[PDB]
């Protein structure tokens, strides 16, 4: 069951159609989320990074998204880690080019609008003013449809309707201002609440070296999923920049961490999760790290409970 993602893709959907047709009401076997996550985690280790989800994986992930979505509508669930692992990998699969394929799919009416991993992601920073610019350049969409594609995408990505986006995390009880949260990153034993306000009861604070869109962003870790009695008072700790770094890393450093990459004028643009060796080598060796930009910054969210900024390579 846990090693479900190591089967053939023909027998991956057939073992996930048998789960939904054989366990229709939630709660009787909540261990099916171990199978729905391991299909996602085995489709993320072999996906070309930041590319739109193609039509073969989008059918496989839509089958095993209903078994997760039957369990977010409840209140108490056994699967806490496996449920939050589906959210972080869906955040890593919802990049700036991924939403560019969904807003095409809702405009033309094709099968790209039935399912996308952005509907279950923990990206709270998506607003109307950003999604009007994330439309694809090649599909020349008229302005009457791209206003209806953003309105339809923002309706499925609602924050309060049918409790589908949040409130099941243990770290969601910490934050007081729920309107100013940008993104939540649930790593193992640490859950980073990336917000735009200091009123987040956590373990420490990290104010970024530059500004975000309007006000500067704060990264508050919640170590071992436990709030504090109050918000952290005093100065916010600085993000230590890393100037010297090696690109050809033979061992498995970085695997477990996160490598969120935001932009000052355009907002946050790409969150990635470093699950194993094949994802780490596909970050360092490709053209992802581009330091000739002016407003793009790369943050490394360690699972130790600290943040680092990548600012140089040999």
């Amino acid at each position, epitope marked *: 069951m846990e090693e479900l993602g190591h089967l053939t893709t023909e027998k991956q959907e057939y073992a996930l159609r048998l789960a939904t047709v054989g366990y229709p009401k939630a709660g009787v076997y909540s261990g099916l989320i171990g199978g729905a996550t391991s299909v996602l985690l085995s489709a993320y280790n072999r996906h070309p990074l*930041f590319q739109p989800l193609h039509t073969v994986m989008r059918e496989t992930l839509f089958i095993g998204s209903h078994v997760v979505l039957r369990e977010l509508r409840l209140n108490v669930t056994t699967q806490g880690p496996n449920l939050a692992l589906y959210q972080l990998l869906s955040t890593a699969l919802c*990049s*700036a*080019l991924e939403i560019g394929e969904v807003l095409r799919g809702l405009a033309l009416g094709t099968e790209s609008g039935l399912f996308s991993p952005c509907y279950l992601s923990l990206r709270f920073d998506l607003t109307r*003013d*950003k999604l*009007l*610019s994330m439309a694809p*350049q090649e599909a020349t969409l008229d302005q009457a449809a791209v206003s209806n594609a953003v309105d339809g995408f923002l309706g499925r990505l609602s924050l309060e309707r049918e409790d589908r986006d949040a409130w099941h995390l243990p770290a969601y009880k910490c934050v007081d201002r729920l309107d100013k949260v940008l993104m939540i990153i649930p790593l193992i034993n640490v859950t980073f609440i990336i917000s735009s306000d200091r009123e987040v009861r956590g373990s420490a604070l990290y104010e970024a070296s*530059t*500004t975000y*869109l*309007s*006000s*500067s962003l704060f990264l508050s870790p919640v170590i071992m999923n436990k709030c504090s009695q109050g918000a952290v008072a005093g100065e916010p700790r600085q993000i230590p920049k890393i100037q010297n770094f090696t690109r050809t890393q033979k061992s498995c450093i970085f695997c477990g961490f996160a490598l969120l*990459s935001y932009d*000052e*004028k*355009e*907002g946050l*643009e*790409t969150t990635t999760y470093i699950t194993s060796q094949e994802v780490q080598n596909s970050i360092l060796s*490709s*053209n*992802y790290f*581009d330091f*000739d*930009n*002016l*407003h*793009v910054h790369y943050l490394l969210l360690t699972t130790n409970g600290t943040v680092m900024e990548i600012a140089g390579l040999y």
Partner: antibody
Amino acid sequence: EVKLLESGGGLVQPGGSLKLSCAASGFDFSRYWMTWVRQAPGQGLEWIGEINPDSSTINYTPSLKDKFIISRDNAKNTLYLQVSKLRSEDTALYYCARSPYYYGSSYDVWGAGTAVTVSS
Amino acid sequence: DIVMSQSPSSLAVSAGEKVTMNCKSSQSLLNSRTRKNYLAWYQQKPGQSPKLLIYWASTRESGVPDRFTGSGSGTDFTLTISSVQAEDLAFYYCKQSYNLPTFGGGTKLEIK
């Protein structure tokens, strides 16, 4: 409307300083990256620098150390540019251009222009 | 140190013919993780402040007419005016927002 408007041009002696100003209305002068762009007499446009909303980061064109000092004041709804050590080639106009967020770091609204001249 | 080029300098039109102008960069202006192609095309009428026509090399700003269909990606970029008229005699500058911004040379449209 928006109507960015500068003031503080004229004829300046060479080898000094000047504090040009900007003035905005009709929109929120805070939460906006404002820039400065100068022309030349009948030549192509040149970029000078920019400043974020809370005055935390300031970029510049490749130049000397303190040739340009950009500093905004959100209470007066003004934006100041201070050109120091005026050479004989700084005669220009000076545009106060606002750069919005989800644009391609381009300049939406441009001001009028203030003729700076440096000579005898 | 991104330096922009433009050709030709003095492009003369007649009232109605389709014309183009190239803005060939020196370095690639392509954001690798969102595919945005940082660029902006500006028009300066003689005796006015510039105007913003295109940004991100294809997305035309609102209020600009439908005759300014500019595109191109990676290093070379073009701007294609569909049917020019006497209300378009102006310079045309291309900017880049990848590095510290650098305007282009400038092409002007002289009616014959």
